[PDB]
Amino acid sequence: KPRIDMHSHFFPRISEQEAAKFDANHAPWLQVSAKGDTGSIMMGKNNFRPVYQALWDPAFRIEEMDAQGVDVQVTCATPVMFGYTWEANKAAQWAERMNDFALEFAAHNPQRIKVLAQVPLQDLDLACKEASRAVAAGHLGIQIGNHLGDKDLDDATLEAFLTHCANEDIPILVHPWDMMGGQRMKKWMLPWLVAMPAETQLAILSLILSGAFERIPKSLKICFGHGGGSFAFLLGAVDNAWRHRDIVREDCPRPPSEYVDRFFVDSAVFNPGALELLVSVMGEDRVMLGSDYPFPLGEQKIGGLVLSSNLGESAKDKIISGNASKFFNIN
């Protein structure tokens, strides 16, 4: 009965100088304070984001896992590490470097710390190669961003990558990143509060409404971060539009809501009513506990929202433990 958190991030101890060998402007690296308790993710010379020790230090993280009653945590790249805009070969080198750093992180206690890998998604062949290599090396799966510029998950290159993983039994976490919105949502974390749930919804609907699930083998294990964004709540409007508009039916042979048996979501929706609706839509077998640790907006008491919810007790057990153990093949 291990309590599993499957949505969490790490960032490796990369020096400015090493990041500079990749991109002096765009490669992230880590600056650590004096006391050693805090630091910032950097981009060239700019502060990109303040972080704390649990992000880069597995010893310290274990102690906090202990304090949260978290038995096993799955952790993956902070999305700033993706490098989807870089020249392909440099990005494939970078992913291999990041993925080895992840394995060194997990090696502190690989019974309790599991890792997912990143891939150079801008090149299908290198991405498939890196996925297979990383999983054979000990990663339990891959974390990708939800889009690659104007390419959403329905794009042939992304569908091909998903198919590869399906065929190789490689589970996928899809994480929103590089949020839409441009110039109008630049205050009060609006891109996190508005653009990010829209991104995740869009990625899910791109697979559904393009008929991608009719081409991708049922073996695909794929989870969408952050509760699937606004997907659960907006699904009625999607089923309605599908029934009453031809251009919505065009490539999708079944009502959209039926495809929920093809994917998973995490539980990070920050409200009992919201989580109940999510479980109602997805089914108790397809929601996994994830906290977004160790980021500020990560769940303060991991699993607390699930245990406070009105859900059945077996549904609670599945969300806290059972569903992830199965999804990521943890024993």
Add this chain to the structure above:
Amino acid sequence: KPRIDMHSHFFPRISEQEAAKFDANHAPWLQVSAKGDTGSIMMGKNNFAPVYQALWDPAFRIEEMDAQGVDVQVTCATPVMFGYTWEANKAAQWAERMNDFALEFAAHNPQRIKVLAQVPLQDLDLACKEASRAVAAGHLGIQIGNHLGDKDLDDATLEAFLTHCANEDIPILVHPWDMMGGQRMKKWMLPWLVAMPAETQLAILSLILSGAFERIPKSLKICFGHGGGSFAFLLGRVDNAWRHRDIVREDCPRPPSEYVDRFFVDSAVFNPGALELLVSVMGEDRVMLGSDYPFPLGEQKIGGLVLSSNLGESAKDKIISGNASKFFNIN
């Protein structure tokens, strides 16, 4: 009991020739085919969008309106006619006719057909005095968009505008418009399933997190179309961000969920669980029945969702009749 429907749309019988007096190109007009049972919308030459002989030919509505237990139906501009892009005075000039053509469509039965006015929201005064003039002529309120044609949607410009309306007792229906993700969402009405609900959430949150409802008189009557988009589902995540991030609190002195008392939404969420969560969040006093009739994606059983739900009798009543009656002051 009555059965009000505060969300429905119309488009007047403007000619190719007469519409060209504003803009033969960017200013829309109604092509009925020839006979009675069909017609299309032209921007001038091109076919903008097909449409339905019930959007106009009023009393036919009464058939539908009576065919579906409806009694009083508020109705307003199909968003094509906003012209927020344009030269101010000619859109000012343009809103006039549409608003005049509005009552002309309401003229048939000013008791069972109420209308709201469009304004040139791109110039305050023009929109102000037009909002003013239009109501005096019988309009029940004002429908605006969240955008301003191609805008970032916040300022004391519109703060002053909402204030203006709050003082002169002018209700507002906000309607999502000209959506956000541009080069993506090219298919399957993705802009309607994804961009528009995010847009409406963005409008609302922009008011809350700007600390606008603090300076706007509580007298403001404002309703958000389509259930407030994804607002209700995503609110927990918004409250969590406000509680744990300073920048989210910079201008909003209360948790955002505390501001639900300053606004209204319709019930058009096409799902019972979605509806139940909507009501749990906003309160029975602040959700109203609406349909987006006669549009294809409009509710097919006007009020049937609300009616076949398991909410309280007071709830069903305040939603189908009570709140519509008070918001728009209707007997």
